[PDB]
A paper describes a structure:
The lipid kinase phosphatidylinositol 4 kinase III α (PI4KIIIα/[name]) is a master regulator of the lipid composition and asymmetry of the plasma membrane. [name] primarily exists in cells as a complex with the regulatory proteins tetratricopeptide repeat domain 7 [TTC7 (two isoforms TTC7A and [name])] and FAM126 (two isoforms [name] and FAM126B). [name] self-assembles through its dimerization domain leading to a dimer of heterotrimers, which we will refer to as the [name] complex. Fundamental to [name] activity is its targeted recruitment to the plasma membrane by the lipidated proteins [name] and EFR3B.
Here, we report a cryogenic electron microscopy structure of the C terminus of [name] bound to the [name]-[name]-[name] complex, with extensive validation using both hydrogen deuterium exchange mass spectrometry, and mutational analysis. Investigation into the molecular basis of how [name] regulates [name] required the production of a stable [name]-[name]-[name] complex. This was achieved by coexpression of full-length [name] and [name], together with a truncated [name] lacking the disordered C terminus (1 to 308, [name] ΔC). To address this problem, we subjected the complex to limited BS3 [bis(sulfosuccinimidyl)suberate] chemical cross-linking followed by size exclusion chromatography, with this complex eluting at a volume similar to the noncrosslinked complex. [name] C terminus was bound to both sides of the heterotrimer. Our cryo-EM structure revealed that [name] engages [name] and [name] in an extended interface composed of three α-helices from [name] oriented in a V, resulting in a buried surface area of ~1500 Å2. This interface is primarily hydrophobic, with the interface between [name] and [name] being ~800 Å2 and consisting of the first [name] α-helix (residues 728 to 735) and the latter half of the third [name] α-helix (761 to 785). The α1-helix in [name] is amphipathic, with the hydrophobic face primarily interacting with hydrophobic residues in three helices in [name] (residues 599 to 616, 690 to 707, and 712 to 723). There is an extended evolutionarily conserved interface between [name] and [name]. This interface in [name] is composed of the C-terminal region of the α2-helix (741 to 756), the N-terminal region of the α3-helix (761 to 775), and the residues between these two helices (757 to 760). No direct interactions were seen between the [name] C terminus and [name], with no major conformational changes in the [name] subunit.
Residue numbers in the entry:
A (entry chain H): 724 to 787
B (entry chain D): 131 to 156, 167 to 196, 213 to 285, 310 to 461, 465 to 618
C (entry chain E): 7 to 17, 24 to 29, 34 to 92, 95 to 139, 157 to 287
């Protein structure tokens, strides 16, 4: 595709994005206060494991 | 009513004598403390009424019979009663004869009011946990900080008046006492004001107390350190020089002076002089001095105008960096800066090894990842550099230089569409981060 | 395993008011080699939804030990990653969950020229907030929320026992010296790494440690202050050095 100068001219101008923060807060609340807690431990353990994996990957890519 | 005051004075003295006698014989202690409280109240009435009569000199029993009761409370642990007694003492009408007692009680209240309670254990003076100043236009205290700051302000305002002006003709006791009082009150003020982060007011207050300072290291050092936090530079540099003159034994002061010289003020000769002074005098301080001297030499190299002195400054800087690294092998900043300086001479493998060692020391540095990514550009390995830039952006999704490097690298490897996408993302980020 | 019987009998407002429950919790949490860490941890989190204070204050004193243990073990090893969930939850409930609005802490500056209650001859200043809510932990915003939770913990200093202050100062001792030769003089053994601390963190650290001097603990506070001032002098941080120097010259 292509990108036009009007795209940037409308990106700089505000588009009225002061209303979705309410539903963002509501979804954060629905994810924390009432969502199940058992899978949170599993997903954060997986996140830590993938962080370790990518750290090892970059460490082994540094030498090469 | 219509009672001569000397009768109140003598009955208060009798109350104090009985209270002294009541305890010295084998509950009733509460009655004795109540007698002390009523003696203090009648003494306050006596002093206020005698002052009123005089306006139309030996305070001996009020202070004892009142303070020592809540001193016994402190020995027992009745903090609330003592706080209430102090509040009712301070809220009373001022007395010119007991201004020193007002000073003392205010200082005692301020000393304990910052290190003896919590936020939820605070109450306004107008509710429970002779003439009294009142009205609706007065400033009602709200929190501990407000009233503590007000008490410190009034104590400082009155304590400046009673200064002996550091007379030192032949006697020194009075000046020493005044200096100790000023030091403690200003220390309380600065410790109270530091926790909230209003440094301009603190700097102004410290500057207000510079009349007493003639040959004092502490006040000058405190003022100099307070000046730097606010943002002012030239006055900070001058006071740092004066402090260096005062006591030439430490190394932190010239290091801070050199840092300020190297910073936004953009001066060079003074930084070199301070670095040489530091290196003239454990091992960490001299390593830091060597690093600062090398940084100054490297900075002078960029702003040159001819050929030879550039190489001379570069070789001096690399020698200084090598010496600093040799003197201390357990700091990643020195290794990173040595790798950065070495890369200027286009010697690639040695700089790569040094930056690898620096990453081994610390693998989360922002600038180290950028340097590693930029090093691969000279070796013509574009995808790996792109991946490193991607990892760095994952760490810092709010930086600017890394994304500029990302745009530059994308424009050379994949195509312009990704560059346009990154540019519009950066525009959106800039709009989000500002108003 | 008294906590096991406690959870068996638990899963009404007078549940709290135990003599040795705090000791048992310290015993189980002092090491990461436990098995009921996640159930008991989400149970500790389950004490926070209720609005009463005798529960939040009863459960709030355990934060520094777990923070040190997890943020030092991770900076080395298996990582649970679920303590960050509780930290983010308490941060969210203290930044947003009051009534629907956020928190804007502010106060006034008294003016001497204006007659007051105690004497006769103010603009709002915000020191914290608003803080946008966090969802994950990274190396860019972790110290901010850590400092915010430390500030939250530093608002009810009276209630916690002396053991909490002892643990706090013990953590404060070796955290800022863990990666320097100075700790080798003090004979500390464990992880030989370093943590890139921030200025506000140590400012709140000094604010917290200043209270411990007049509550029995004397030598530990003094050595912690010496370590803090040494680290600040090595790192060239003006404000912590100023605070430490001010505290030094006010001891009888």
């Amino acid at each position: 595709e292509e990108i036009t100068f009007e795209a940037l001219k409308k990106a700089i101008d505000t588009s009225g994005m002061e209303e979705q923060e309410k539903e963002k807060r509501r979804l954060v609340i629905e994810k924390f206060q009432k969502a199940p807690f058992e899978e949170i431990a599993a997903q954060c353990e997986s996140k830590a494991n993938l962080l370790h994996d990518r750290l090892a990957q970059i460490l082994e890519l540094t030498i090469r | 009513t219509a009672v001569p005051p000397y009768r109140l004075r003598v009955i208060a003295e009798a109350y104090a004598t009985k209270g002294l006698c009541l305890e010295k014989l084998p509950d009733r202690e509460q009655d004795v403390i109540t007698c002390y409280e009523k003696a203090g109240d009648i003494a306050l009435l006596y002093l206020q009424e005698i002052e009123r009569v005089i306006l139309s000199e030996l305070g001996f029993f009020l202070e004892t019979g009142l303070q020592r009761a809540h001193v016994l409370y402190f020995k027992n642990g009745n903090l609330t009663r003592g706080v209430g007694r102090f509040r009712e003492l301070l809220r009373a009408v001022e007395t010119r004869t007991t201004q020193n007692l007002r000073m003392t009680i205010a200082r005692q209240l301020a000393e304990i009011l910052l290190r003896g309670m919590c936020e939820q254990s605070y109450w306004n003076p107008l509710e429970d946990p002779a003439r009294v100043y009142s009205g609706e236009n007065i400033f009602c205290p709200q929190e501990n900080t407000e009233e503590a700051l007000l008490l410190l302000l009034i104590s400082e305002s009155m304590a400046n008046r009673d200064a002996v002006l550091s007379r030192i003709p032949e006697h020194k006791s009075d000046r020493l006492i005044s200096l100790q009082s000023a030091s403690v009150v200003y220390d309380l003020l600065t410790i109270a004001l530091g926790r909230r982060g209003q440094y301009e007011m603190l700097s102004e207050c410290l500057e207000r107390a510079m009349k007493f300072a003639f040959e004092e290291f502490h006040l000058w050092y405190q003022f100099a350190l307070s000046l730097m936090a606010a943002g002012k530079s030239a006055r900070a540099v001058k006071v740092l020089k004066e402090c260096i003159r005062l006591k030439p034994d430490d190394a932190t002061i010239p290091l801070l002076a050199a840092k300020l010289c190297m910073g936004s003020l953009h001066w060079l000769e003074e930084a070199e002089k301070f670095a040489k002074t530091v290196v003239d005098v454990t091992s960490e301080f001299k390593a830091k001095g060597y690093l600062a001297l090398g940084l100054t030499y490297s900075l002078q190299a960029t702003d040159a105008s001819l050929r030879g002195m550039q190489e001379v400054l570069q070789r001096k800087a690399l020698l200084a960096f090598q010496r600093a690294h040799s003197l201390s092998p357990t700091d990643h900043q020195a290794a990173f800066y040595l790798a950065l300086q070495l890369a200027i001479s286009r010697q690639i493998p040695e700089a790569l090894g040094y930056v690898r060692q620096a990453l081994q020391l610390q693998g989360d540095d922002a600038n180290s990842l950028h340097l590693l990514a930029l090093l691969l550009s000279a070796q013509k390995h574009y995808h790996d550099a792109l991946n490193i830039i991607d990892m760095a952006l994952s760490e810092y999704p709010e930086n600017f230089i890394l994304l500029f490097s990302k745009v530059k690298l994308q424009s050379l490897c994949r195509g312009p569409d990704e560059a346009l996408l990154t540019c519009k993302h950066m525009l959106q980020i800039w709009k989000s981060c500002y108003n | 395993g008294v906590v096991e019987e406690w959870l068996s009998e638990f899963k009404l407002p007078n549940y709290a008011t135990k003599s040795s429950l705090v000791s048992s919790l310290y015993k189980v949490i002092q090491e990461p080699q436990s098995e009921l860490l996640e159930p008991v941890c989400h149970q500790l989190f389950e004490f926070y939804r209720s609005g009463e204070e005798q529960l939040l204050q009863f459960t709030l004193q355990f934060l520094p030990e777990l923070i040190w243990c997890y943020l030092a073990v991770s900076a080395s090893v298996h990582s649970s990653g679920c303590i960050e969930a509780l930290l983010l939850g308490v941060y969210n409930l203290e930044i947003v969950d009051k009534q629907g609005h956020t928190k804007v802490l502010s106060f006034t500056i008294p003016s001497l020229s204006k007659p007051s209650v105690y004497h006769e001859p103010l603009s709002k200043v915000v020191y914290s907030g608003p803080h946008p809510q966090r969802e994950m932990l990274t190396a860019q915003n972790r110290f901010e929320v850590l400092t915010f939770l430390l500030l939250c913990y530093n608002a009810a200093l009276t209630y916690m026992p002396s053991v909490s202050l002892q643990s706090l100062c013990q953590i404060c001792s070796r955290i800022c010296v863990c990666g320097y030769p100075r700790q080798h003089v003090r004979k500390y053994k464990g992880i030989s790494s370093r943590i890139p601390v921030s200025s506000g963190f140590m400012v709140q650290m000094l604010t917290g440690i200043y209270f411990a001097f007049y509550n029995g603990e004397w030598d530990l506070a003094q050595k912690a202050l010496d370590d803090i001032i040494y680290r600040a002098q090595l790192e060239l941080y003006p404000e912590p050095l100023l605070v430490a120097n001010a505290i030094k010259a006010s001891l009888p």
